[PDB]
């Protein structure tokens, strides 16, 4: 019972990474998310510090020099924000709001009010990070 | 009991850590980390909405890429109307020490390309190169300890 216990425990776990296992059983990698809004990182530097995937769920992510930690030298302390908020409906809305003094921008165009966001938008903030934002839900309906 | 709660929490602590899993203070995950001591494959296809994962581990041993359903079984499975049932194989071996060797090697009538090169017999990756499968499948291949001994020389 306590093995059952423990191999549920680990097949929810692989569910919330998206993480794909083979069937013989090992580990073969992680899932684009199919239900969760997020940001894929595009430095190509395999020794970075931050995460190649963010998940961006209900809710407040914050982004700053906070939840979304960035080591790019122009990233403020507080940086930027992201809210996702459903409203009982079937589809997140995201938004990005800038904090002060914080350059931040989408599709090239710099951020000075909340922004709704749409699936294939490219963020950048600061010099060095830049980010594709996904939206697969919207997507789908796009 | 307390043996039986904390060794499902030691089990999600270390599964965290394996999987390079990062997670919020108010405990939601956060996040996945590239693989800090494994060689992988990124996705560079930009539609959220694919068939592949965003992510492969490129693991000791075999990796055989092809498509779904046998004959012999694929480790790595790819949708393009050019992917041979046998595609390509990854091969990774630690010899003998201290990072892993990655070669990539052809299937017969298979294409695959590193940096523009057709791949016609295992040849070693290189942490940054740019692999084609097929005609439509397109990943960055990674070796994170390669990478760094090399950042690391004098």
Redesign the interface.
Known sequence: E?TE??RM??EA??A??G??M??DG?????????KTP???NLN?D???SE?????I?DGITRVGRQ??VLSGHFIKEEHCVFRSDSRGGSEAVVTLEPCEGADTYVNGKKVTEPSILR??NRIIMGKSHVF?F???EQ??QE
């Open positions: 306590f216990a423990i425990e680990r776990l692989l919330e990474m993480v794909a083979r069937e090992g580990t073969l990698g992680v899932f684009s998310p199919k997020h940001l894929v190509e395999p020794l970075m995460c190649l995937l963010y998940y769920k939840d979304i699936s294939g594709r996904n939206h697969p997507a789908r």
